[PDB]
Amino acid sequence: KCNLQGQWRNKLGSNLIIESVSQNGEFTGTYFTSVSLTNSTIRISPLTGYQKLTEKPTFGFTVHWAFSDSITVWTGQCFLNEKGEEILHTMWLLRSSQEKEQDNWTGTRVGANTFTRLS
Amino acid sequence: QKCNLQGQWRNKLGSNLIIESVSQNGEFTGTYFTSVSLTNSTIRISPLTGYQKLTEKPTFGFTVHWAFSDSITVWTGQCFLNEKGEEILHTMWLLRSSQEKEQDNWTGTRVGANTFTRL
Amino acid sequence: KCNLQGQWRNKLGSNLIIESVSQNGEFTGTYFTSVSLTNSTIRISPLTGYQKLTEKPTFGFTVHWAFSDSITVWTGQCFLNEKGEEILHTMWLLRSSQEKEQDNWTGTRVGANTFTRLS
Amino acid sequence: QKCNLQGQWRNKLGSNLIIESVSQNGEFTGTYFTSVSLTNSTIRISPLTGYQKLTEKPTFGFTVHWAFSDSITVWTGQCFLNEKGEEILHTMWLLRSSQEKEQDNWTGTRVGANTFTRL
Ligand SMILES: O=C(O)CCCC[C@@H]1SC[C@@H]2NC(=O)N[C@@H]21
Ligand SMILES: O=C(O)CCCC[C@@H]1SC[C@@H]2NC(=O)N[C@@H]21
Ligand SMILES: O=C(O)CCCC[C@@H]1SC[C@@H]2NC(=O)N[C@@H]21
Ligand SMILES: O=C(O)CCCC[C@@H]1SC[C@@H]2NC(=O)N[C@@H]21
């Protein structure tokens, strides 16, 4: 357990799917967000990242949003909770595209996400 | 120049960021050589993977898979041309350190800014 | 509801007490953390901050830890959940004291906290 | 100088930070005049309250209660003497914007760094 492959959901209802993990820790997959900053139609978006291949692995990944000019990165660690269920504790940075360097200071949001298996 | 991220970059800490040819979909890989680290372990060159947007003044994000520790760092940011026409990467980062227990998770994520320019 | 006065707890088990709120939004109180970075004895610590006096108020405060050289700031907003119970959604920055400016980059942690009334 | 925070400070955005006499317990108040804001509303001088540590190279934190918007910003950081003996405040900040609904909470917190020096 704490295999990162497969499907996960966060408390927002977003879906993270990790398709494969390589021996050097590299992984690829897709992200489907339940929420967004604008009203454009949300589309499945690709991700790439890395995990440690340790007990309780740390990891990070980037999502290249297919429907906006934003990028989000997450980093976190996997643990088993009290019930022995896998949980990914993460923090994220959401970069929005600014028109000019003078507005750069406005361009980065932060938050936490908690991912668990689909019940 | 028009913020194609390919090439050598340096931040104010003196870390070296090297980005390879950006793929048609914006995906890139590269290497990171940090000038600073959390402990006394010898710093080794580390791989990175990420994406950039394909628009003017691109947003981007990437993950560095540290070769010498159990940590992971992610950056996200946006490239602008400064006042001198010179390119500049404005970034924020999250550094995840590996914790031994789920109860210590709250301690595991550092945050900062980095500013990268061409050498 | 969303009066900030009185006692609150977060998921770590920490206790936030807001003693009074003034007409200009200023508030004072104490914080008792259930967790810390070191092994020194945790002691009740003072806080000062401000809230908006609006529906669903935003707020921020600083805790002057009495038992370490750290400082933490929180900012967030109060809402009523589905049950009609008050909830404070917050993000925090924990600054630890560094010995030298060269290590400044290591000195700031980030996370989320969720505060509710004692049940 | 020894990082007593009393006085006038400026950051790279050009915002003005003014801190009054620090009390015996480290508490301070002051005023903040930002050079930049999220919307087109006219910027007004805004009050702040916070604390500094009483040790060499003090950590500190404060909250600004914006007089012209429903937002709140908190900063935390540490004062060092740079290489030129000149004092410098290294900070990170969280800017909370007021959301209309609990469901939009994830959008409500921006993050950045600020660097303050004496005028
Ligand atoms: O709106 C955009 O421009 C892109 C989608 C951003 C969705 C964010 S990423 C952080 C948070 N966690 C999620 O599952 N969705 C939101
Ligand atoms: O110490 C570790 O475990 C890994 C190295 C972390 C170095 C950090 S990443 C953010 C900051 N920017 C840098 O260029 N280096 C440090
Ligand atoms: O260890 C220290 O130096 C001070 C205590 C830090 C406790 C942090 S603040 C963020 C998080 N939320 C809490 O209720 N406690 C921890
Ligand atoms: O626009 C608002 O609603 C309030 C003003 C926010 C200004 C931010 S606070 C962080 C950054 N640093 C500054 O000196 N100004 C901006």
Side-chain angles (χ1 to χ4, degrees):
Chain A
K1 10 199 51 276
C2 282
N3 291 310
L4 298 188
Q5 294 96 328
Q7 294 203 54
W8 302 85
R9 57 162 287 130
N10 71 18
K11 301 184 300 169
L12 294 163
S14 301
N15 211 64
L16 163 70
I17 302 178
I18 291 174
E19 166 68 33
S20 70
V21 179
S22 293
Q23 64 168 318
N24 70 339
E26 192 171 358
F27 65 85
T28 176
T30 60
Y31 201 98
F32 194 94
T33 181
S34 285
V35 297
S36 65
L37 302 167
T38 66
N39 296 149
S40 301
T41 298
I42 295 162
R43 300 174 180 275
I44 298 176
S45 299
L47 72 91
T48 187
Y50 292 104
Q51 70 166 109
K52 259 63 193 182
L53 288 167
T54 57
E55 191 178 348
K56 301 172 210 145
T58 53
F59 56 85
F61 60 93
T62 305
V63 175
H64 184 11
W65 300 109
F67 57 91
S68 79
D69 290 334
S70 300
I71 291 289
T72 303
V73 294
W74 285 254
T75 189
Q77 191 169 0
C78 188
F79 299 96
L80 296 175
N81 73 4
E82 321 188 32
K83 294 99 165 66
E85 297 161 338
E86 301 159 296
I87 182 155
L88 310 180
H89 288 298
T90 73
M91 295 290 301
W92 54 262
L93 294 173
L94 165 50
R95 174 75 205 207
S96 50
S97 176
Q98 304 307 308
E99 326 255 62
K100 49 194 187 176
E101 193 185 24
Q102 290 68 48
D103 292 343
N104 180 73
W105 68 272
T106 77
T108 313
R109 287 176 171 83
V110 65
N113 279 169
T114 306
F115 294 88
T116 51
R117 299 297 194 176
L118 287 41
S119 179
Chain B
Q1 53 256 352
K2 296 246 65 180
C3 285
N4 203 301
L5 293 183
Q6 62 172 57
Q8 301 166 57
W9 302 87
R10 199 197 89 114
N11 72 21
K12 297 190 291 175
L13 291 170
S15 298
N16 289 294
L17 162 71
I18 300 169
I19 293 173
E20 304 176 65
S21 280
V22 185
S23 298
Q24 57 188 118
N25 68 336
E27 197 168 354
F28 63 81
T29 57
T31 62
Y32 202 98
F33 194 59
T34 183
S35 63
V36 295
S37 64
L38 288 178
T39 72
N40 291 15
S41 280
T42 304
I43 292 157
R44 305 287 173 200
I45 186 79
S46 299
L48 66 91
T49 187
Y51 299 99
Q52 75 160 97
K53 248 57 203 182
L54 302 183
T55 45
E56 0 193 20
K57 302 159 288 204
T59 54
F60 59 86
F62 59 91
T63 301
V64 171
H65 179 16
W66 304 108
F68 58 93
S69 80
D70 291 339
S71 306
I72 299 287
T73 305
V74 295
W75 283 256
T76 189
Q78 186 171 8
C79 181
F80 294 97
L81 295 178
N82 79 344
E83 293 152 57
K84 296 176 88 192
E86 297 157 337
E87 293 160 315
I88 182 163
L89 309 188
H90 294 281
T91 77
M92 297 288 296
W93 53 258
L94 295 174
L95 163 47
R96 175 74 200 207
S97 51
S98 170
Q99 304 308 307
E100 36 156 31
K101 287 178 277 89
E102 196 194 2
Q103 71 181 77
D104 292 338
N105 183 73
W106 67 272
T107 73
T109 310
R110 284 172 173 85
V111 61
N114 277 170
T115 305
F116 296 89
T117 52
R118 306 289 201 176
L119 300 165
Chain C
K1 10 199 51 276
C2 282
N3 291 310
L4 298 188
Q5 294 96 328
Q7 294 203 54
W8 302 85
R9 57 162 287 130
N10 71 18
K11 301 184 300 169
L12 294 163
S14 301
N15 211 64
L16 163 70
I17 302 178
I18 291 174
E19 166 68 33
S20 70
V21 179
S22 293
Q23 64 168 318
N24 70 339
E26 192 171 358
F27 65 85
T28 176
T30 60
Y31 201 98
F32 194 94
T33 181
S34 285
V35 297
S36 65
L37 302 167
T38 66
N39 296 149
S40 301
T41 298
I42 295 162
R43 300 174 180 275
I44 298 176
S45 299
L47 72 91
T48 187
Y50 292 104
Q51 70 166 109
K52 259 63 193 182
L53 288 167
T54 57
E55 191 178 348
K56 301 172 210 145
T58 53
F59 56 85
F61 60 93
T62 305
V63 175
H64 184 11
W65 300 109
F67 57 91
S68 79
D69 290 334
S70 300
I71 291 289
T72 303
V73 294
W74 285 254
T75 189
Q77 191 169 0
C78 188
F79 299 96
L80 296 175
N81 73 4
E82 321 188 32
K83 294 99 165 66
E85 297 161 338
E86 301 159 296
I87 182 155
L88 310 180
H89 288 298
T90 73
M91 295 290 301
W92 54 262
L93 294 173
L94 165 50
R95 174 75 205 207
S96 50
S97 176
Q98 304 307 308
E99 326 255 62
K100 49 194 187 176
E101 193 185 24
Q102 290 68 48
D103 292 343
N104 180 73
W105 68 272
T106 77
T108 313
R109 287 176 171 83
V110 65
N113 279 169
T114 306
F115 294 88
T116 51
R117 299 297 194 176
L118 287 41
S119 179
Chain D
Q1 53 256 352
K2 296 246 65 180
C3 285
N4 203 301
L5 293 183
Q6 62 172 57
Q8 301 166 57
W9 302 87
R10 199 197 89 114
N11 72 21
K12 297 190 291 175
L13 291 170
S15 298
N16 289 294
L17 162 71
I18 300 169
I19 293 173
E20 304 176 65
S21 280
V22 185
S23 298
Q24 57 188 118
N25 68 336
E27 197 168 354
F28 63 81
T29 57
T31 62
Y32 202 98
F33 194 59
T34 183
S35 63
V36 295
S37 64
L38 288 178
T39 72
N40 291 15
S41 280
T42 304
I43 292 157
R44 305 287 173 200
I45 186 79
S46 299
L48 66 91
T49 187
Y51 299 99
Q52 75 160 97
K53 248 57 203 182
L54 302 183
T55 45
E56 0 193 20
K57 302 159 288 204
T59 54
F60 59 86
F62 59 91
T63 301
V64 171
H65 179 16
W66 304 108
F68 58 93
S69 80
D70 291 339
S71 306
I72 299 287
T73 305
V74 295
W75 283 256
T76 189
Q78 186 171 8
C79 181
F80 294 97
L81 295 178
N82 79 344
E83 293 152 57
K84 296 176 88 192
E86 297 157 337
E87 293 160 315
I88 182 163
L89 309 188
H90 294 281
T91 77
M92 297 288 296
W93 53 258
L94 295 174
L95 163 47
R96 175 74 200 207
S97 51
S98 170
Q99 304 308 307
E100 36 156 31
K101 287 178 277 89
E102 196 194 2
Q103 71 181 77
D104 292 338
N105 183 73
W106 67 272
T107 73
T109 310
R110 284 172 173 85
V111 61
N114 277 170
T115 305
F116 296 89
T117 52
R118 306 289 201 176
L119 300 165

